[PDB]
Amino acid sequence: SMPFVNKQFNYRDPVNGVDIAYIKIPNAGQMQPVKAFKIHEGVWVIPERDTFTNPEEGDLNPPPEAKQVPVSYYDSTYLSTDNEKDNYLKGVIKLFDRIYSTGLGRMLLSFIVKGIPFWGGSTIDTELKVIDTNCINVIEPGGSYRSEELNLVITGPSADIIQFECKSFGHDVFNLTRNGYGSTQYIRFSPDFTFGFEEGTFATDPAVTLAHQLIHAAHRLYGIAINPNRVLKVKTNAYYEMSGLEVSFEELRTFGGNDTNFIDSLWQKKFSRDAYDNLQNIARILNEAKTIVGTTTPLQYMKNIFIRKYFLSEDASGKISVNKAAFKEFYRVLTRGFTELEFVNPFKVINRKTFLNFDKAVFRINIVPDENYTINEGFNLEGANSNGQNTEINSRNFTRLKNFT
Amino acid sequence: SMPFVNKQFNYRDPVNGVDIAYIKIPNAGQMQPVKAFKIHEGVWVIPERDTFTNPEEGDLNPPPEAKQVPVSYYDSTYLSTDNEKDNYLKGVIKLFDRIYSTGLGRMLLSFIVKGIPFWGGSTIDTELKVIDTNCINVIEPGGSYRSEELNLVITGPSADIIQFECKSFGHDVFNLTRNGYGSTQYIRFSPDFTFGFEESLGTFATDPAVTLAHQLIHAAHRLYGIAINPNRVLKVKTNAYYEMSGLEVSFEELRTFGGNDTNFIDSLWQKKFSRDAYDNLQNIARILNEAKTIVGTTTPLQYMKNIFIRKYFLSEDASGKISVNKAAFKEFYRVLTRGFTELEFVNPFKVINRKTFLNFDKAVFRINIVPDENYTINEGFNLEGANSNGQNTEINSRNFTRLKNFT
Ligand SMILES: [Zn+2]
Ligand SMILES: [Zn+2]
């Protein structure tokens, strides 16, 4: 019942340079400042359509029908008015509160908040330094600017309104999402739409959809995401030779349950070994660090951030190391405790059972009013059932916009 | 506690032409007669190696070792002596009694006994006639034979002892297993071996009653003509240089196993399979309504119509017109496809079991279930208590002799 977001935010609240500010994303060259809200330590929400993180995706034009995929939805006017942005902000906040009301969501969000990208940006071996792509540029009242570290940004979707994804900026030398370091994560997401599926009789709770992307973000903030070149190719058609479906190992892991079982035990051992090896490397770097630059935080306090992040051990002499048992639990939580299917019962929802059950339609929803959707029950306000997710019974809460069939 | 098999059978019991006789399968061209036991109405057991249903698999020769797959087991001497065939016979009967001791198995076996293959074999549209794939020839004193209908035959395995499967004749040219008609089913099976597996990630052994129930579920689907087309398959592949082998599993197998595997079948496929089965019952209803004669039997036409009215849970109105009731079909189809799964038997049998096909068996073990000190009708291997220590191949090591690992 403790909320994740400890104060009320309205889109029209005046900027203050602290938790309501105009910001710019350093890797986005051509952007004008956008109003953003720091809803929790390290977590910002930008209630705008994402035209700025990627130069190529800088417009909201729907492609020609022949280039569209069936599972997509376009509306260039969505999220253009202040009333819409206020509703978007409140809906995203409500979902974080819903996630945080479960034991598992509390653990997921604590990992995310603790998951400071590693300070591995110095060329000098004994010196800790931030990596500049894990910051935003904050505009302050008075015309002054500052750089500020953060872990997670939620933005509105790009052109395709239902293409939810978790992305981050790259490094010239490191694969930050896979070398244990982590990097600031940017999630495209909308609380104003959800998908329908059949046992489109039932609507997905948008809290599950956000939790899914937050699991990708946690994997990527802890630098243990599976290489996107590890992929499973699926066919259910005896006739199409080439045509089929492709799903990454990272997606099989993140979804969980029986889908993860498509990943061989030998791959799991390898990923575990690799993540353990990368923690050992980070410990060596922390042990060899003697100076720190770009902050007034003392060196030991900065080391402690990562001792806590990676559940590292420290002995009497200050030597940092990886405890095998602590790593085992750390890795289990991140890869097996945090899955989409593990959230189904804590949320008390009905949900898709596998990636092979494709969404059938997209619906408009409005979760901000408590008579429609609550923190503790989502759509299922009336009782301990999934009638609230039934798009026929509870039809007033789900307006069908497009079928994918 | 009532058994499925209401009398005792010994392999050496003298033939009697009724429930112990030498038989020939008409669709198996070159087979010599084999001793068979009618353990229940419509159900026969042939306690010998299957060298006769398929002439090409008429030998027990182990293929060249270089040609063998890891998941296989060969022993040309298994089931060669009368003592072995007797032990096989009694073990299969014991598993039927174990299945029959559960409410769900009793329902499954009731569907199997009632599931007479449809009499749709006539060249004339208005005439009911048997289809020849659904009979055996029973040898009588004097060497002459008579034709007798049946639903199910259990035989010993062919060359590969652990290749358990449910098969039927005319599968190449007929669609009897998918058009609602059904056909007599032949199961290769052994109660003398079972598989070991590890709890989800060969410490635990599968209860052979679960394995037989699995094959009987295939048989029920095929006796009711609702089997999913075997070209409906789930195929997964990775890069060709990856050690981990791609996989192939039919939709029919995903359905039969149950649980989370069935969820890999998209709802749109499920709706189609249901619609197809409903349409095929409408065809059967139309054929029964238009039937005016019956041939090859003194059973009156109306009695045979009633047999299939009951089989398919068809409705009759005041005028005698047969039709499919939507609610009756929905329940009919649910029972056959959702009620009868391998995983639905796990708790009735009180066993530990694999949860998915993606958890592959690790080994094959020799077992001996006939002695009650090893395995009972009501408890299987788990004699000790309400646990699965009886299935632990380490604790209960005396009941599981490891023969081959598949890794
Ligand atoms: Zn995903
Ligand atoms: Zn099967």
Author numbering:
A (entry chain A): 2 to 200, 213 to 418
B (entry chain B): 2 to 202, 213 to 418
Please quote the authors directly.
Catalytically inactive recombinant LC/A3 spanning residues Pro2–Lys417 and containing the double mutation Glu224Gln/Phe336Tyr was produced with an N-terminal cleavable 6xHis tag by bacterial expression (for details, see experimental procedures). Crystals suitable for the determination of the high-resolution structure of LC/A3 grew within 1–2 weeks, diffracted to 2.0 Å resolution and belong to the space group P212121, with two molecules per asymmetric unit. The LC/A3 structure represents the typical globular BoNT-LC domain fold with a conserved groove that extends from the catalytic site around the enzyme. The electron density is well defined for all residues, with the exception of loop 200 (amino acid residues Ser201-Ala212 and Glu203-Ala203 of chain A and B, respectively), which is likely to be disordered. BoNT/A3 is the subtype with the least conserved LC among subtypes and shares 81.9% sequence identity with LC/A1. The overall structural organization of the LPH region, however, is conserved between LC/A1 and LC/A3. Our structure also confirms the observation of Pellett et al. that the LPH region in LC/A3 contains a cluster of basic amino acids that is absent in LC/A1 (20). In our structure loop 250 has a different conformation and points away from the active site. This different orientation of loop 250 may explain the inability of LC/A3 to undergo autocleavage. However, the observation that their catalytic pockets are virtually identical and other substrate-binding residues are largely conserved suggests that LC/A3 may accommodate SNAP-25 in a similar way as LC/A1.
Botulinum neurotoxins (BoNTs), secreted by neurotoxigenic Gram-positive strains of Clostridia, are the most toxic bacterial proteins known. Each BoNT is synthesized as a large precursor that is cleaved into two polypeptide chains that remain connected through an interchain disulfide bond: a heavy chain (HC, ∼100 kDa) and a light chain (LC, ∼50 kDa). The LC domain is a zinc-dependent protease that cleaves components of the soluble N-ethylmaleimide-sensitive-factor attachment receptor (SNARE) family of proteins, a process that blocks acetylcholine release at the neuromuscular junction and thereby causes flaccid paralysis of muscles. BoNT/A and E cleave synaptosomal-associated protein 25 (SNAP-25) and BoNTs B, D, F, and G cut vesicle-associated membrane protein (VAMP).
